Design an enzyme around this catalytic site. Structure first.
Site, PDB file in Angstrom:
ATOM      1  N   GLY A  61       0.899  -1.197  -0.019  1.00 26.42           N
ATOM      2  CA  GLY A  61      -0.022   0.021   0.157  1.00 26.42           C
ATOM      3  C   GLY A  61       0.770   1.271  -0.096  1.00 26.42           C
ATOM      4  N   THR A  62       2.022   1.092  -0.479  1.00 27.08           N
ATOM      5  CA  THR A  62       2.860   2.413  -0.348  1.00 27.08           C
ATOM      6  C   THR A  62       2.678   3.157  -1.555  1.00 27.08           C
ATOM      7  OG1 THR A  62       4.719   1.390  -1.908  1.00 27.08           O
ATOM      8  CG2 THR A  62       4.773   1.059   0.467  1.00 27.08           C
ATOM      9  N   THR A  63       3.209   4.531  -1.600  1.00 24.76           N
ATOM     10  CA  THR A  63       2.815   5.552  -2.493  1.00 24.76           C
ATOM     11  C   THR A  63       3.344   5.401  -3.673  1.00 24.76           C
ATOM     12  OG1 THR A  63       2.563   7.111  -0.638  1.00 24.76           O
ATOM     13  CG2 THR A  63       2.838   8.115  -2.754  1.00 24.76           C
ATOM     14  N   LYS A 118       8.705  -2.258  -7.444  1.00 23.06           N
ATOM     15  CA  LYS A 118       7.155  -2.193  -7.636  1.00 23.06           C
ATOM     16  C   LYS A 118       7.063  -1.568  -9.054  1.00 23.06           C
ATOM     17  CE  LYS A 118       4.543  -0.836  -4.445  1.00 23.06           C
ATOM     18  NZ  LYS A 118       3.884  -0.194  -3.408  1.00 23.06           N
TER      19      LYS A 118
END
EC number: 3.4.25.1
Lengths: 98, 213, 179, 237, 230, 242, 249
Positions: free
Chosen positions: B40-42, B60
């Site tokens: 759920g990182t930016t 990612k």
């Protein structure tokens, strides 16, 4: 049933064919779905016996799935099935005798 | 069906009832069960003068084609599977056609495949690339909706990064300025920062297509 | 219902895999120097272990060569991802040596098969956070087989016996241990 | 003409392909079955005993269930399918109804299965005929025959394969109420019937015996030789 | 003659004649050769469109399947196209399942299995093509051939198409095992020149090579340079 | 259904002792049943298709007789052979183009459309139920990064791209004339391409044309849309040529 | 003939001419041999793909491994043989998954023969033109050797041959085979002699013959393919023994 997606996943080709046939009939006329269905039946009437795995090359060419990969092609390989019935029983079932 | 019918491939729905009973039974007996991995990182993206800048914090940033890249958030397995399937389909398309693919084709494929499963596959994606038409940036949601925007943000620090863009974004920037803006917006939400740069000057759309290494 | 705990550690030209025992099988061999460990529901563990051997045997017969750990990881991931909407309750752990290069390899997967390749150690079970600190504290690179066995035994014991498999190039050592 | 398709009638009402399917039966080894007072006996001729052959894999007598056995004559590969189907159907009917199956019931099932394959031009009939024998729940011995066309009948003694004419002619006059008094007498009668068409002594005989509340038993070559010697001694006397 | 029309009919001597006629159709196509060297494989063929009215970058006879696999044919082009598409799809499926490029032998086996099916059912026709497949796996080259009947062989050097017996005779005495790639290309072009029936130019032949870097189709400039060299 | 017919040239799925398909070969002679000839020439920045118009009866409405069709807003076509087969293939091509646009989000290219049509045509030669269509298709269009395109597909399922091609009865003579002209020169303006095509047809057929006996369709880089010329423009070109 | 157009028609005397022709098709293939001994089973074949420009890959061209306990050899059409071997492997793996125990050899042979028989009864299909030999070991009967026909028939043998000169090979084996007192060495010598007298070659060479052996060691079944050095040694021993026998006359 057990999941909302089970029935939807089981019947996908039928629904897609129905939608294409309805659109084609509304746009062009009655002849195009008739011809498409006859070609499908003709190319589908020839294949291996049901207890052996086929390839469905001409049917895939006619449908247009000869350049596409889905989840039905990479999950749960039907060629390497873990269960299979007797040959004569499968052939008789395909004919509707059972 | 019947034992006399030939088998078919795809997903399997055999453990649904047993799991439905077992989860409640374990809940009302006080035991834990394994779960799924989530991210759920930016993630962010900006359209500059002649390319796309994609950024993510820690890779990612997935690979779709030599001119298209993607970023994902949600369940990791879903993003991996969707990216791999779309990349294989685009490689087949490029082999058949002989030219580099288009961003709209990838967007349409992802839209249709995410809509087919009614949002049960949780994958939110940020898509960008450069075409013969030019640079394009998209944003796709798990239920099958898409927006074409000049800048998007997803993840946890979405609000801060969106504020940074709305405060400091101008059209027709440079490469260094766009990279600095993306890095600052990513850092405004929090590790390190990972950047991917796609440039029009490093892509040739006239030579015949060849399979990349 | 308790589940279990599976651990794997990497040394110098050797690997170790460990699981707990109380006084069902959790570690199965998939090759000469390849092992897999599973933790979770016993029925699902048995089903996965039996279904993996079918595919492995067919692959080794058709290909005509020994399988690599990466390919085994990919096969496990595919088998787990099918049945994504109703999943098996298993958390696989893979450890083994390269059949032609003899290089260590360890890995870990989750419920639906998202791999994680780690250079030093992997931990699976319902007490991953409890054992992660111990594994980080007691691990050092370039460990001889005896040192690796001792440190993995200590890591298992500090968080009811254990069983440890030590995989070498030319031998396999199995030891049952009690605190 | 009128014989190049399975479902074509002759101008005088004949289905010639189904009749040709019986010429294959008329070329198999002879099989004889005799129904006794409290015993049932089967016997099959052994033909072309190769030197490097294993006799375990070429037996022509099979056990369908705990109280039903069968012998066949015709194509060897066609009999295996029918035997397996009957074996499965026996257990299916035992699941359906707790009581053990009936000889007539299994004969009717086999006859219907054989008849199913004479209805379409896309498949060919089974070129076999069978002798189904066994015991009922009450304890009454039974004997039946099945044809490639799907018809069945009840008999007291019969023969199939080559030599059936001579064997039946012998049986019609040698089958009385005195020859079936004892198990030994019934076995001797079956051996005598077989010996009419079988040369080279009693080395080409395979025998099976079933009694009440017992399982199928296959006689040994030594026992067959002893019976043959007794028959020869009695004939000489 | 009564057994020469049906595909599912055995001759009294135990022969299938329609497969022989498909092989005869294969034997009447354009020539093609293939030579396996010590560090690569070379495929060569003769073009069909020998005219100035032909657009060069429209249709090719040498095609790639993966980064390390390519093939050429001899026979009917329409039958070749669908087989090429199916081979590409099979390779992509294998990569998706196993996360590793497919070996050449597995692809050949799958393609032959697909081809075999059309020789055992009524109402269809066998494929009228024969394929040459080259690859590079585990640091060594490969070369395979596939018949219309679904049988495959592994070769060191072979020729097929029009006038292939004399081509094989030439290759038998002109072939050396410890041979480099450039001399292999020279030998392949000479074998093709043996029965060209015309004057060769860099615009009526096609050449493709496979080595550690992967499969690649040669440009007309390189073909012209090689032709001038020999 | 009926069953195959015995003979080496009476069914589609039977090979001959030399491995030939005579039923496929006989479909190439149905193209000459109409008796007309088509010519397509590609220029520096344009493509032209010219065909022959024949209206024998005076009771026909000449507005309803044509052989030039519009598949897409940027793709044109000319058909040679049987009329009903040509119309059915045009309908199928339109359906395939619509499917491509829906699935991929942008317009189909000429080469991709020709390849799809040829792939469909190949299936008819391997199954014992369908029969090949007695017609051939020629397509023109403008590529945004490559330029003008000319493509042709055959009843056997074979397609290729050309600089100038022909079809019909006088195909060989047209091919020889075009080969000589292209060997002499290949860089032409818009006016020279149409004049080349008209001169080829006139020389091969040994006839002087009237503006009501031919059909002309063009595409251009400046105006990519497919256009059909009018009688006034055709007459102007003929007057300039003469 | 008016009764030999398809597999679903009987002749007036009750024969299946298409099946007979399919069985006749086997005589064109190479020679395959199998011998049963007291402590092992043997399989010897003849190489047909002999050419200076052919490459050597895989482990064998006519011998296949089905599971950990069984192996087979084919004679006939290679394209059909491939399908049959793949199906055999699938059946063995299915039984192993079902019962957690290896499948018996006779059960595997019957399972394949049912499939082979099903293709001679339904119209529109062409029967397989393949014959097979099976060797293996199981806990019920020990070492075994079987044979199969295109019609779907099988049987158990102690020594048999399929392919070219099958009748002559069978006659020689029947004349010079001892029952109950055979070992692997004597079986290999007999196989070499039979192959030498069967193949129509003046001098036998080790590059046109392949031999496989099955045996049990320490509770495990070992399947190995002999090496050219061993084949050459066997051929040399046979030749020198024949020379000795000729000279002592």
């Amino acid at each position: 049933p057990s999941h909302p997606l089970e029935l939807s996943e089981k019947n996908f080709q039928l629904n897609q064919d129905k939608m294409n046939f309805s659109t084609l009939r509304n746009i062009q006329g009655l002849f195009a779905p008739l011809k498409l269905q006859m070609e499908f039946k003709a190319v589908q009437q020839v294949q291996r016996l049901p207890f052996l795995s086929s390839s469905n090359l001409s049917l895939d060419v006619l449908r247009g799935n000869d350049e596409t990969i889905g989840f039905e092609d990479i999950l749960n390989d039907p060629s390497q099935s873990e269960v299979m019935g007797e040959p004569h029983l499968m052939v008789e079932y395909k004919l509707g005798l059972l | 069906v019947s034992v006399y019918a030939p088998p078919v491939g795809g997903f399997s729905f055999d453990n649904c009832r047993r799991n439905a009973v077992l989860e409640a039974d374990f809940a009302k007996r006080g035991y834990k069960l394994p779960k799924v991995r989530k991210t759920g990182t930016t993630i962010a993206g900006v359209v500059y003068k002649d390319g796309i800048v994609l950024g993510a914090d820690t890779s990612k940033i997935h690979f779709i084609s030599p001119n298209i890249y993607c970023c994902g958030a949600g369940t990791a397995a879903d993003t991996d599977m969707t990216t791999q399937l779309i990349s294989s389909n685009l490689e087949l398309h490029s082999l058949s056609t002989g030219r580099l693919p288009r961003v709209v084709t990838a967007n349409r494929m992802l839209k249709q495949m995410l809509f087919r499963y009614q949002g049960y596959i949780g994958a939110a994606l940020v898509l960008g690339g450069v075409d013969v038409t030019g640079p394009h940036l998209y944003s796709i949601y798990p239920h099958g909706s898409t927006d074409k925007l000049p800048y998007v943000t997803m993840g946890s620090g979405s609000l801060a990064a969106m504020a940074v863009f709305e405060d400091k974004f101008r059209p027709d920037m440079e490469e260094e300025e766009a990279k600095n803006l993306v890095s600052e917006a990513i850092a405004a939400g929090i590790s390190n920062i990972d950047l991917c740069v796609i440039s029009k000057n490093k892509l040739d759309f006239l030579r015949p297509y060849t399979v990349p290494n | 219902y308790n589940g279990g705990a599976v651990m794997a550690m990497k040394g110098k030209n050797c690997v170790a895999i460990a699981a707990d025992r109380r006084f069902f099988q959790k570690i199965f061999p998939m090759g000469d120097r390849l092992y897999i460990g599973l933790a979770g529901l016993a029925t699902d563990v048995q089903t996965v272990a039996q279904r993996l051997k079918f595919r492995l045997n067919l692959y080794e017969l058709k290909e005509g060569r020994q399988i690599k750990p990466y390919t085994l990881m990919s096969m496990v991931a595919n088998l787990l991802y099918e049945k994504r909407f109703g999943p098996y309750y298993t958390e696989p752990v893979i450890a083994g040596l390269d059949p032609k290069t003899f290089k260590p390899f360890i890995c870990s997967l989750d419920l639906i098969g998202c791999p994680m390749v780690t250079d030093d150690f992997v931990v699976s079970g319902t007490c991953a956070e409890q054992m992660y600190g111990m594994c980080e504290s007691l691990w050092e690179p370039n460990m001889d087989p005896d040192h690796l066995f001792e440190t993995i035994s200590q890591a298992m014991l500090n968080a009811m016996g254990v069983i440890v498999h030590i995989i070498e190039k030319d031998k396999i050592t199995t030891r049952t241990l009690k605190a | 003409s009128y014989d190049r398709a399975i479902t074509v009638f002759s101008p005088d009402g004949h289905l010639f392909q189904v009749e040709y399917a019986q010429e294959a039966v008329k070329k198999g080894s002879t099989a004889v079955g005799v129904r006794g007072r409290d015993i049932v006996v089967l016997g099959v001729e052994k033909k072309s005993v190769a030197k490097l052959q294993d006799e375990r894999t070429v037996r022509k007598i099979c056990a369908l269930d705990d109280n039903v056995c069968m012998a066949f004559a015709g194509l060897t590969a066609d009999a295996r399918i029918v035997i397996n189907r009957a074996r499965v159907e026996c257990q299916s009917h035992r699941l359906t109804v707790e009581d053990p199956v009936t000889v007539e019931y299994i004969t009717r099932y086999i006859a219907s299965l054989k008849q199913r394959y004479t209805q379409s031009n896309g498949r060919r009939p089974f070129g076999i005929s069978a002798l189904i024998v066994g015991f009922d729940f009450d304890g009454t011995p039974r004997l039946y025959q099945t044809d490639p066309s799907g018809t069945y009948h009840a008999w007291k003694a019969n023969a199939i394969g080559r030599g059936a004419k001579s064997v039946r002619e012998f049986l019609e006059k040698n089958y009385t109420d005195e020859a079936i008094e004892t198990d030994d007498l019934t076995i001797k009668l079956v051996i005598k019937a077989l010996l009419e068409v079988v040369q080279s002594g009693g080395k080409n005989i395979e025998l099976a015996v079933m009694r009440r509340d017992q399982s199928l038993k296959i006689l040994n070559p030594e026992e067959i030789e002893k019976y043959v010697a007794e028959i020869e001694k009695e004939k000489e006397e | 003659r009564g057994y020469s029309f049906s595909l599912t009919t055995f001759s009294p001597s135990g022969k299938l004649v329609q497969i022989e006629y498909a092989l005869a159709a294969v034997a009447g196509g354009a020539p093609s050769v293939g030579i396996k060297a010590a560090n690569g494989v070379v495929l060569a063929t003769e073009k069909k469109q020998k005219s100035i009215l032909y657009d060069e970058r429209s249709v090719h006879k040498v095609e790639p399947i993966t980064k390390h696999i390519g093939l050429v044919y001899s026979g009917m082009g329409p039958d070749y196209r669908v087989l090429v598409h199916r081979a590409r799809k099979l390779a992509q499926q294998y990569y998706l399942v196993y996360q590793e490029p497919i070996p050449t032998a597995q692809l050949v086996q799958r393609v032959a299995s697909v081809m075999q099916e059309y020789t055992q059912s009524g109402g269809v026709r066998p494929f009228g093509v024969s394929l040459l497949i080259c690859g590079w796996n585990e640091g060594r080259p490969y070369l395979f051939q596939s018949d219309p009947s679904g049988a495959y062989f592994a070769w060191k050097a072979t020729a097929m198409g029009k006038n292939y017996v004399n081509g094989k005779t030439f290759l038998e005495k002109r072939y050396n095992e410890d041979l480099e790639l450039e001399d292999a290309i020279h030998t392949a072009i000479l074998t093709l020149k043996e029965s060209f029936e015309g004057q060769m130019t860099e615009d009526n032949i096609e050449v493709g090579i496979c080595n550690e870097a992967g499969f690649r189709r040669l440009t007309p400039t390189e073909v012209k340079d090689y032709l001038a060299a020999i | 259904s009926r069953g195959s017919s015995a003979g080496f040239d009476r069914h589609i799925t039977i090979f001959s002792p030399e491995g030939r398909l005579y039923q496929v070969e006989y479909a190439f002679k149905a193209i000459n049943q109409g008796g007309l000839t088509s010519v397509a020439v590609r220029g520096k920045d344009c493509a032209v298709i010219v065909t022959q118009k024949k209206v024998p009866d005076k009771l026909l409405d000449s507005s309803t007789v044509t052989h030039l069709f519009k598949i897409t807003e940027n793709i044109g076509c000319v058909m040679t052979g049987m009329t009903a087969d040509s119309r059915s293939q045009v309908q199928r091509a339109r359906y395939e183009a619509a499917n491509w646009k829906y699935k991929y989000g942008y317009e189909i290219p000429v080469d991709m459309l020709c390849k799809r049509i040829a792939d469909i045509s190949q299936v008819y030669t391997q199954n014992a139920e369908m029969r090949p269509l007695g017609c051939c298709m020629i397509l023109i269009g403008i590529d945004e990064e490559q330029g003008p395109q000319v493509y042709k597909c055959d009843p056997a399922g074979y397609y290729c791209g050309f600089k100038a091609t022909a079809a019909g009865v006088k195909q060989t003579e047209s091919t020889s004339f075009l080969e000589k002209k292209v060997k002499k020169k290949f860089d032409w303006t818009f006016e020279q391409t149409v004049e080349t095509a008209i001169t080829c047809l006139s020389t091969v057929l040994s006839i002087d044309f009237k503006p009501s006996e031919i059909e002309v369709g063009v595409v251009t880089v400046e105006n990519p849309k497919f256009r059909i010329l009018t009688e006034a423009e055709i007459d102007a070109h003929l007057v300039a040529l003469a | 003939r008016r009764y030999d157009s398809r597999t679903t028609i009987f002749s007036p005397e009750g024969r299946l001419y298409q099946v007979e022709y399919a069985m006749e098709a086997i005589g064109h293939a190479g020679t395959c041999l199998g011998i049963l001994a007291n402590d092992g089973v043997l399989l010897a074949a003849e190489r047909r793909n002999i050419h200076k420009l052919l490459d050597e890959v895989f482990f064998s061209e006519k011998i296949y491994k089905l599971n950990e306990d069984m192996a087979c050899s084919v004679a006939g059409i290679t394209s059909d043989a491939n399908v049959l071997t793949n199906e055999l492997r699938l059946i063995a793996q299915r039984y192993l998954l079902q019962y957690q125990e290896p499948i018996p050899c006779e059960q595997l042979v019957t399972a394949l023969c049912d499939i082979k028989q099903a293709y001679t009864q339904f119209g529109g299909k062409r029967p397989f033109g393949v014959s097979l030999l099976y060797i293996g070991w199981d806990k019920h009967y020990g070492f075994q050797l079987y044979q199969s026909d295109p019609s779907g028939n099988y049987g158990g043998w102690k020594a048999t041959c399929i392919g070219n000169n099958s009748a002559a090979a069978v006659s020689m084996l029947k004349q010079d085979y001892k029952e109950g007192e055979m070992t692997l060495k004597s079986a290999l010598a007999l196989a070499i002699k039979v192959l030498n007298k069967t193949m129509d070659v003046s001098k036998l060479s080790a590059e046109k013959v392949e031999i496989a052996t099955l045996t049990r060691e320490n509770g495990k079944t070992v399947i190995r393919v002999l090496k050219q050095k061993e084949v050459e040694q066997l051929i040399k021993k046979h030749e020198e023994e024949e020379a000795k026998a000729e000279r002592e006359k």
